[PDB]
Amino acid sequence: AFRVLKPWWDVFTDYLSVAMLMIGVFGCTLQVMQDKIICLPKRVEMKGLKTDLDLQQYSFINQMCYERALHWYAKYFPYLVLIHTLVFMLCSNFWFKFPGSSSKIEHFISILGKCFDSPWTTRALSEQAKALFEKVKKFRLHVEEGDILYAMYVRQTVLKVIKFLIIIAYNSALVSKVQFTVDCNVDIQDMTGYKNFSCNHTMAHLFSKLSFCYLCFVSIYGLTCLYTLYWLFYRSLREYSFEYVRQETGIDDIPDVKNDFAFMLHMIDQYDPLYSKRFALFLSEVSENKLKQLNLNNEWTPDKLRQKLQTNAHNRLELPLIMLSGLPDTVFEITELQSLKLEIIKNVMIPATIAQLDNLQELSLHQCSVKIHSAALSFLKENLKVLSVKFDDMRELPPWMYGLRNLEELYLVGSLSHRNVTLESLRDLKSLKILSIKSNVSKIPQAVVDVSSHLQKMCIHNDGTKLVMLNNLKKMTNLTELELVHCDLERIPHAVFSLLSLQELDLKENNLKSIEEIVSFQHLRKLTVLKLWHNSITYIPEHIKKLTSLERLSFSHNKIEVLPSHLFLCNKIRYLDLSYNDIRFIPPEIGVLQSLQYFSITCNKVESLPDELYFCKKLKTLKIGKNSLSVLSPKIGNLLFLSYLDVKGNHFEILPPELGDCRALKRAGLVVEDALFETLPSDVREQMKADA
C-alpha cells in the first residue's frame, strides 16, 4: 500500500521533485544567510572619492534601492521554486490523499497482496483461500463500477504537464531579467543628497547559474510526463485482455476486466507481470469449483459419512445427501452401502470412481441435474437395480438412464405431460420389474409398451389427470400387479379386463359408486387384491360374490349402509376393510368367511354384533372404529388368535373378564377407552399389561 504503487517514471519524477526541494531549500537558506545588497551614489593621479555619509544612511539606501530596482523574481526565486516543488509533490500524492480513491486503492492492494500470498494459487497452478475468493468477487463487483480513479489520475498527469509548460515558459524569460549589477534612479536626493545609485547583491550571479541548472531539472521532469502521456494515449487502458494466461493455463474464463481494473492490471504489470499472473486465477470460477471440491473432501470424512449412513425405506444401507456442491471423494471409499440418495445437488458428474462402489443396487435423485462418466455408465447398467428420481422440469432428467438394463425397480416423481408425456423409449430396461410414476399424465405412453414384455409391477398415481387413452394399458398383459390412485375414472374402464395375469387391483381416489363391470372380472379369476380407496360406492354389486380368488378386499371411504349378505360367497377372503362407510348392521352369514383374518369398519354407524362374527376365529385384527356397540359377547374367548382389536369409540361400559382368554391380545393390541379397561378385573389386566 506504500511501495508497489509506483511505476518507474513515477519514481523518477519523485526523485526529481526531491532534488527540486533540495534546490529550493538551499536557495532560501543562502538567501536568508547572505541576501545583502551594496549601494553607492552614482553621479559625480587619482585619489579617494569620499562620500561623507554615515553607516545608517547606507543601510537605508541599501534597503530602499533593494526594494526599488532589483526585480521581484530575483528576490523571490527560492520561495517560488520551493512552492512549485511542493505543488508537484501534493499534486502527485493527492492520488492517495483523497479518501474516496484511497479506500478503493487500499482495498485493492490488500486483496492483491493476500491473493499473491496464497500458496493455494501455486497448488492450483501446479483452503483458507476460499474465504479470499468471496472478497475477490466482492471487490470486483463493488469497484468495477468506478473508473473515476483512472480519470482523476489522468487529470493529475495533465495538470503536471501544463504546470511544467507554464514554469518553463515564464522562467525562460525571467532568468535573463536578474543581473549582478543594477542601477537605481530613485528620488531619495534632497533627503540624502543623492539621486542615482549603483548597486549589486551577492546572490545574483549564483542564482543565475543556479537557476540555469534548475531549468534543466524541470525539462527532464517534463519529458517524463510526455512519456506517461504517450503511455496514456497509446494503450486504451479502459480495457485489458489477458489472452496469454487463458492461452497458457487453458482456462477460458477470466475473459477481461473493467476500465479501472485494466488500469490497475497494467500498472502492476509495469511493476511486475508475475503479480498479474498470480492475481489472475482467483478470478477463475473453475479454481473456486476445485477449491470447493477440496474443502468438502477435507470436511467429508468417511467416518462422517458413516455417521450419516442409515437404512433406506427398502431395507438397504443408504447415505443421505441433502445439500452438496459435488461428490466428496471419501464417499467412494465406502462401498458397502447398498443404497444412496442425493437431493438438490445440481451440476454434478459421476466419475469412473463409482467402479469402487460395487456393492450398490439402489440410487435416488431428488432434483439433481447430474451426468455421468462412460465407465460410470457401464457400472450403472451392470450394477444398479433400483432407481428413484424426483425431478421437476426434466432438467434433472438424464437421457442415459434409458440405457440402463439391470434396473428392476424404478420410481418417477415429477410431472411429464404438463398433455402427452415426453417420455423417451423404455427399450434397454431389459431387467425392469417395478415401475413407479407420480406425474400428471393423461395418456399411457408408448414407451411403456417398450418394456412390458418382462415388467411385473407398475405404479401410477396421477394428481387427477384422468387416463383418457387406454390402448397401451390393454397391452400390459405380462404385467401382474396394478394399483390406481386418484386416476379419476369414476367407473371401471374396459382396459381393466384387458389384463388377465393381474392379481392385485386398486382404484384409489377414483370416486367409484357403481362398479358393476364385475361381469368381466368373471373373466379375471386371478384377482387376489381389490382396493377401492376414496370411492363413492353406496351400491354394492352382487356379481362380486361370483369371484373365488378374492383374498383381501378394500372399500375404504365409501357410502353403502347395508351390505348384502350374499357377498359372503367369496369365502377365500382374509383381509376385509369397509371402513368410512355408512354401514349399520352385520348379517349373520358373515360367519361363513372363516378365512377372514382382518376386519376394519371404522367411521361407520355399525350397531349390531352377531356372535357369528366370532365364528371366523382366524380374525386377528378387528377394527370397528368409533361406533355405538354396547355389549362384549363371551365368544371373544372364541378368538384365541385375536392379535389386534380396535373398539375405540363404542358403548362398552364394564368390560367382562373374557379378554383373559385372549392371550394373543395384550395392552398394545387393545384399542378401547381407559375407563373401559378400568372395569376389567385384576387377572385380565395383569395378563394383558405384563406376563403376570
Next chain:
Amino acid sequence: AFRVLKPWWDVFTDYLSVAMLMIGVFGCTLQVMQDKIICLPKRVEMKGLKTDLDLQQYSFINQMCYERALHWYAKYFPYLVLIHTLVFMLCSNFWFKFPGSSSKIEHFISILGKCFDSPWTTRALSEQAKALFEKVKKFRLHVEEGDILYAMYVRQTVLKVIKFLIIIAYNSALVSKVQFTVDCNVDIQDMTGYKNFSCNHTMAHLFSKLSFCYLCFVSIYGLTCLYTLYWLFYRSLREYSFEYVRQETGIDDIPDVKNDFAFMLHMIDQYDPLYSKRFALFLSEVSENKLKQLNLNNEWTPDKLRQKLQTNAHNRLELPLIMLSGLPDTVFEITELQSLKLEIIKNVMIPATIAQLDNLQELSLHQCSVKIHSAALSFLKENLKVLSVKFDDMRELPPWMYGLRNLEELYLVGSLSHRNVTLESLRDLKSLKILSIKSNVSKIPQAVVDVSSHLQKMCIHNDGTKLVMLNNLKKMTNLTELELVHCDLERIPHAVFSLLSLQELDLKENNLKSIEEIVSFQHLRKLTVLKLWHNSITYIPEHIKKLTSLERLSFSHNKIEVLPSHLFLCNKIRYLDLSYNDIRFIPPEIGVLQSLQYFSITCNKVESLPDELYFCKKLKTLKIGKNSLSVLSPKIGNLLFLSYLDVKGNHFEILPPELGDCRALKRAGLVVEDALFETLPSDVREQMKADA
C-alpha cells in the same frame, strides 16, 4: 538484507562517496562563513597611504572584484563537489531503487536466507523444507526470464567510470586556475575614484590543498571502477556452472543457471561463496526426492500400515496402497504380509529392500507405473507366485515382468488388441499354472502357448469381443480348465474339442443357442463341470446323456422352456441350476439323479412338485425361488441333509411342520415369507430358529 548485496568494491565506493559529501559540506560551510576576498586600489622615508574610503566602498569593491577577476571555478568548486557527490550516490543507489529489479532482488534475498537457514541442507550434505522446495522452483522458473540486472549494473559502472573520467579531465586543468593573489581593473572610477585593484581571498591556498586532497579520492574511485569493469569484462558472468558442488557432493543435477541467475550467484560468491553453496542444494531434484521420501516416512509408520493390513481375495496378508507417490520405508520393515496391492502410484522404483520381505507370494498394480531394482527383480523372480496387473494404456505395464519365472497366478486388467493382442513372449515364466485376462481381444496371442507347456488353468474374459481365431488355444496341452466368459461366441468353437484335458468349462454371456456339438464334446470324457450362463439355448439335445462325468449344470438366464427327460440319464450330477428359465413343471425323472446336492430354479414357472424330488436325499441345498408353486409336500421330511431352502415368491399359505424333520435346514436355510413361517408350530419354529 542489504549487507550481502555489496561486494568490497561497492562498499569502498560508498565510503568514498561519503567522504566526498563530507568534503563538500566542509567546503560550502567554510565558503559561507570565512570566504571573503579583501581588495585594495592598486595604482597609487615611507609613510602611510590613507585612501580615505569608508567601510562601505570597501565592501562594494570587495564584492565587485570577488565576482569579476576571481575565477568562476574557484567560487563554484564546493557546489561542483556537492553535485558530483550526489550524482554518484543517486547512481549507486539506483540499482536497488528501481522497483522492477528490486522486487526480484528481495525475493532472491528471502529465498537465499531461507535456504541457507535450512539444516536439512547440512543433513543431506552430511521436514517442512519440502514446502521450501516449491518456493525454490517457482523462484527459479520466474527469475530465469531476466538478464536486466546484469545490463543495469554494467550501465551503472559505465556511468560511474565516465563521470570519473570527466572529473579528472577538467579538474586537472582547472585546479591551477585558482590563485592566492589576483589583479582586477574594473571601471569603478567615478564610483570610488579607482580603476585598478589588488585582491586575495583567504581560502585560496586552502582550496588548492583541499582540491588536491579531493582529487586524490577521486582517483582511487576510478581505479575501483576499473577493477569491477575488468572483473565485469574478464569472466563472462552471463553463464555460471557449479562444477565443484557437482563434483564435491557427487550429484550430477543442478547443471547450470540462467544469465541473471549466473550474475546473482557470482555476486553472492564475491560476498560469500558458502551462501550460494548452501543455496545450491535446494536446486537438486534428487535432494527434493530424498526429502519427500523422508517426510513421507515421517508420516508413514509400521503401525499405520498394519492397521491397513488385511486379507485379500486369495486369503493373504495384504497391504492396500491407494494414493501414494513413493514407497514408504516402513513398508520394508513389515515382512509378515503375504500379498501387496498398489493403486494409482506412478514414478516409483522398488528397491532391493524387498529382500528383507521374503514372505511374499502375491502382488498387485492398479494403475501404477513401477520400475524395479535388479536385486529386487531377482528376488521377485525367485519369490513371487501371484500377481495382479491393472493398466489403462500399457504405459503402466513394465515388460520386465515377462522375465519372471516362479510365478503361479497372473491377472491382467486392460485392453490388449488396441488388432493384435499386445503380448510379449511368455516363455520366461517357468511356473505359471493359472492365468486370468480382462481385455477386449478377439484372438489368442501366440506367446501363451509358450507357457501352455506347463499352464494348468486359462481364463479369458473379454468385454464382448468375439474370439474369432482359436488356433493357438488348441495347442494348450497342459490346459485343464478353460473359461470363455462374455466372448460373444454364439456357437461352440471347435478348439474346445482340441483340449483333451478339459475338466471345467464356462460359456457365460456368449448367448449360444445351438449346442448340438455335444457329440464332439463326447470326445472329452473328463467334462466334470459345464457352465451355460446367459446363453440362448432354448432346448437340450439328447447327446448330453452320453457324458457321464458331468457333475454341475448351469442354465442361469437361458431360454430353456421345456426340459427333456434324457437329461436325467446322468446320475453323477450334484449341482443343477436351471434358474431364470422358462420351465413350467418338472418330470419325475429328477428322482433318479440321487447324487444331486444343489438345485436352483429361481425365476422359473414351476407350479407343482414331482414327489420324486423328495427321493434324492443328497440335495443339501434347494433354491426353488420365486415361481408359481402353491403347496409344500410333507415328503420334504425325507431329505434330512437339506440345509437350505429358497421357496420365497410362491403361492404357499401354510408350511407343514415336516420341515422340522430336516435338522440341517433351519431358519437360516428357510427362505420363506414371515406369514408363511408363522404357519409353523411354536415347537418347530423355535427348533429351527434357535435352541428353543
